Write a protein that binds this DNA or RNA. Structure first.
Lengths: 123, 205, 310
RNA sequence: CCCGCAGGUACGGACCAAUGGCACAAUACUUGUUCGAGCGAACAGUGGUAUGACGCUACGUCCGUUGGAUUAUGCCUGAACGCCUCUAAGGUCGUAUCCGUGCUGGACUGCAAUGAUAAAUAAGGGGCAAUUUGCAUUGUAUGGCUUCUAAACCAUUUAAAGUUUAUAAUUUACUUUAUAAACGACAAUGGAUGUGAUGCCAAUGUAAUUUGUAACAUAGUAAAUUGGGAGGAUCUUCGAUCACCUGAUGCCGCGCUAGUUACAUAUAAAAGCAUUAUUUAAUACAAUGACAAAGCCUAGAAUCAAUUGUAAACGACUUUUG
RNA sequence: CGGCUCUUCCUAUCAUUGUGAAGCAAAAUUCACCAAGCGUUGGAUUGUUCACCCAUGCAAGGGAACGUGAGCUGGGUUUA
RNA sequence: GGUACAAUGGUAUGCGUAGAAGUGUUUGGCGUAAGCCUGCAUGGAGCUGCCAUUGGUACAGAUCUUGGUGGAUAGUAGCAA
């Protein structure tokens, strides 16, 4: 977050701090290129795909070194990435419907005799 | 409509010492209260006026140096003088007492339903029972006018409107029960369920 | 209580992006005037404003179109009426809905105005530029332009009274006791064009205008009426100032004086201007390789355009 | 001296018409070089000198307040203390102080008034719903149904004050006064005066299915609809604010109490005789909710991007876009 | 350690406001009361800190965070 | 007195590729407590109870030692002779 500087284009995200990570946003187009080119061979129609799950993981770092005042050496570490997409097609979504199981006993409606069935329809 | 005994007790703040009412209220509000104090411009403080003015002006002097906007905010209305007394007698940094403070409404000068509602007194806070003849006292409405509250004579004009609205609702309700006293002679031959059975309460009722 | 018609520039005040809109304000509230109109809302509202209210104001707007700025979006504001008998403030303002008001009927001459407005902004500044601290000696490491002690050890925090850096200007100010020197009579053309004569005085009798030679620099055209105000007022370029009747008495014999201007300098403020009117630049100086040539490229060509023809 | 007048010091807050300072690295000259010579050429990190708008800027200009309680003190009235006394009650004058006004911020984000109210026109959004339904849950209501008091004590005055009613005088007003009674801080009143004279109930069925059917003396009551005046707004539980209410138009002309006395009819027994048990809700009253459920109405804006330059570290800000 | 810078606080009141008192005629002063709002300066010599000196000033009060060295300076003090 | 770790001598006609050690865990437990047993998941070849005798036998600290990692910070550090 900090100290990234506050931009104009970030009212849209209800934030103030935003930025324009060009090389970051360019590797996520070369990724979504493969994730679209994999829906091709499966036969999915790309204008209905939705990015279902996206995550980035930090990969193993790489070693370089600065050189400091009074004769010292500090680490200069590049921190790479691991990105995963799964894109799933979106149709008219009938979502889910859980199962029903009976917990039935036979003395149900004799203590309910005086209460529910022959008790007439009120308002 | 409701309250944990009745709708809320509305205490008229007129004639009541401030700290002897602020403690029976703070106790009652920690028990589950819902009170309202109306006419908070009429509460009393014992001792003569300058003795209390001094005490308030010294209260106005406490302010954080590195920021006065952090410091003790000195509310100057007579209702938010009374709320200062009640907030000290509450634990207000626990949720229990902050919910106890949320059941408290305090008003400079009796509006908005609590003018047609029912006013109860608290006869242990009442000044004419505790203090003496020849002790001196003031009102919080005089104290607040001399320290920075601007609505002393807003709420004096607002109140005599309200005390002239009540001049006719006591003119209706005094003639409208010249007829209930009339009607209680035309149902004298009732059957006889007044003539004997309410000689249980029974010489006046 | 609004009005029936609001002018288009003075209805852009309710629009952050007006050019894109359907201009649907106030397309519904105007129709309370052409319904049953009293039991619609309006006559009960004026009766509601008479029965209960002790202060009556007026929403008035400016005509930012007439000044040829870029803005086009009029400033509206509430201007309190201050005459007696509360019935008369509504009777004055029920009459004046959509009718225009001049400066000449609010302010006079020899009157003490308070001007209210926002000063000229100057940015993030240091503590020397802003609070007027003494500068530090020249051999100061890490900065001359500071305060050297922003406080004691105890209270163990910095206070609010210590002079500190961060923004300068564009503060809201109310400057008191500026004097009207001239209520101008601007715009136009009684029979011939009288858009002159604002700067004509009893001693001058030159008509010129209150505008200098070359316009007012950066803010620049004045043709409407005006209030001429003793030395300075708040703000900047083009900035809306709010003139105000005085909240004070005026016993001070320097603020009771009737004035009479002998002369108003309308020389050119884009330099060191040397002449009042452009006539005087042609009385003192002569015709240049200019109006010499342009007065002899018209009457000469009118007998020389036919030279190819004949 | 008081008071009036005219200025200045210091500080504050602005401003740029004039004057002073900074340089359009605008323009003139000029040194060295370089372009064959000749130019409103170049280079010397601004070659140097001079003048120098805009803008910034002081060494210039303009502007800089008002009421209240009242401290110190001087008194008034006046005792205990037969007189006297600023004090004991009670009055009073009153500070560069204090607290406010004016001025500057504004709970980040408090509050009030107000404007418009969508991707429409095939189809669907959005209200107005409270009537619209079954449905489902909510809260109060717990086995009717272990409730309301949103009707009340007046405003200011007061520990011999402080109270009522009555009557004869009187009000702009239970106006103010004169006689006579009443408990002269009883138990009273601390709850019910149920303070528009309350209800767990009318219904002669009072409740986990229940409903009620006639005669004799009383009683006269709540009832739904469309065009005028007087009234109601204190940081909000529905403001094209509006509830007794001018004279008009027609009905269900429906439901009705209380009392004596008569008759039909119907529900009701939870299994236990240590009937306490999940200690509950079919009840009624208010409230949301989603799936197929009927109509009434509606037809926007904001932000980004670009733009401005009254602004600016960046945001933000003042602006403009057929 | 001082000085420079800058802010706030005290009153043990120098001055000013409002006063009471004088062996208070006026002027000038002295004593005391309420009182901390505004003010309390420019230099020569010394690293000083007080005191002294020139001068202006209606009038030239006393102190607090040993205030203040990632604020500076580095003269005093204090390593080689 | 009791409990963890590793061994050696005996012992359990002990356990184990039909899943040992280890690890993971809202599986269920037992113990005042150190700790223990158990299910499931991963794992793939060894291990445990008892009697004795032991030992390089139990860690939070030592500006401990070796290794790994977090903020600070994706940066008002900075990458301007």
């Amino acid at each position: 977050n900090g100290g990234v500087g506050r931009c104009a284009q970030a009212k849209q995200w209800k934030t103030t701090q935003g930025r324009w990570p060009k090389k970051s946003a360019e590797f996520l187009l070369q990724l979504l290129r493969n994730a679209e080119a994999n829906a091709d061979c499966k036969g999915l129609d790309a204008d209905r795909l939705v990015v279902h799950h996206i995550q980035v993981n930090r990969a193993q770092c790489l070693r370089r070194r600065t050189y400091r005042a009074h004769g010292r050496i500090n680490p200069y570490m590049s921190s790479p990435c691991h990105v995963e997409v799964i894109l799933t097609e979106k149709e008219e979504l009938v979502s889910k419907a859980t199962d029903d199981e009976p917990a039935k006993k036979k003395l149900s409606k004799k203590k309910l005799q005086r209460q529910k069935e022959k008790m007439l329809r009120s308002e | 409509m409701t309250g944990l005994t009745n709708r809320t007790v509305v205490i008229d703040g007129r004639g009541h010492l401030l700290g002897r009412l602020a403690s029976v209220v703070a106790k009652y509000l920690l028990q589950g209260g819902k009170v309202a104090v109306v006419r908070c411009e009429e509460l009393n403080l014992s001792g003569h006026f300058y003795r209390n003015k001094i005490k308030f002006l010294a209260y106005l002097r406490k302010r954080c140096n590195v920021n006065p906007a952090r410091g003790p905010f000195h509310f100057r209305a007579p209702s938010r003088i009374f709320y200062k007394a009640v907030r000290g007698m509450i634990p207000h940094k626990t949720k229990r007492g902050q919910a106890a403070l949320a059941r408290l409404r305090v008003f400079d000068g009796i509006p908005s339903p609590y003018d047609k509602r029912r006013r109860v007194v608290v006869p242990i806070a009442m000044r004419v029972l505790t203090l003496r003849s020849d002790r001196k006292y003031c009102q919080v409405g005089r104290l607040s006018h001399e320290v920075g509250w601007h609505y002393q004579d807003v709420i004096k004009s607002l109140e005599r409107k309200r005390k002239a609205k009540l001049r006719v609702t006591l003119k209706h309700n005094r003639e409208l029960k010249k007829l209930t006293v009339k009607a209680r002679e035309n149902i004298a031959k009732a059957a006889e369920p007044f003539n004997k059975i309410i000689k249980s309460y029974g010489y006046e009722v | 209580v609004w009005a029936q018609h609001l002018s288009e520039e003075c209805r852009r005040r309710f629009y952050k992006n007006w050019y894109k809109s359907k201009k649907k304000a106030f397309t519904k509230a105007s129709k309370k005037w052409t319904d049953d109109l009293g039991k619609k809302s309006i006559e009960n509202d004026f009766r509601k404003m008479l029965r209960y209210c002790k202060v009556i104001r007026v929403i008035a707007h400016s005509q930012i179109r007439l000044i040829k700025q870029r803005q086009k979006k009029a400033h509206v504001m509430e201007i309190q009426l201050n005459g007696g008998s509360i019935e008369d403030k509504v009777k004055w303002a029920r009459e004046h809905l959509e009718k225009p008001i001049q400066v000449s009927n609010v302010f006079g001459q020899d009157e003490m105005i308070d001007c209210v407005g926002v000063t000229k902004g100057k940015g993030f500044k240091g503590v020397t530029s802003r609070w007027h601290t003494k500068k530090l000696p020249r051999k100061t490491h890490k900065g001359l332009r500071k305060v050297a002690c922003i406080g004691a050890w105890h209270p163990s925090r910095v206070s609010t009274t210590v002079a500190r850096a961060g923004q300068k200007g564009y503060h809201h100010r109310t400057e008191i006791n500026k004097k009207i020197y001239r209520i101008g009579a601007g715009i136009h053309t009684k029979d011939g064009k009288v858009i002159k004569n604002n700067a004509s005085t009893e001693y001058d009798l030159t008509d010129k205008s209150i505008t200098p030679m070359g316009g007012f620099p950066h803010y620049g055209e004045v043709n409407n009426d005006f209030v001429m105000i003793k030395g300075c007022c708040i703000g900047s370029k083009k900035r809306i100032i709010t003139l105000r009747k005085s909240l004070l008495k005026h016993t001070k014999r320097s603020a009771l004086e009737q004035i009479k201007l002998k002369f108003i300098d309308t020389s050119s403020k884009m330099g060191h201007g040397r002449f009042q009117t452009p006539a005087d630049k042609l009385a003192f100086m002569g015709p240049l390789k200019k109006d010499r040539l342009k007065e002899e490229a018209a009457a000469t060509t009118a007998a020389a355009a036919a030279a190819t023809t004949t």
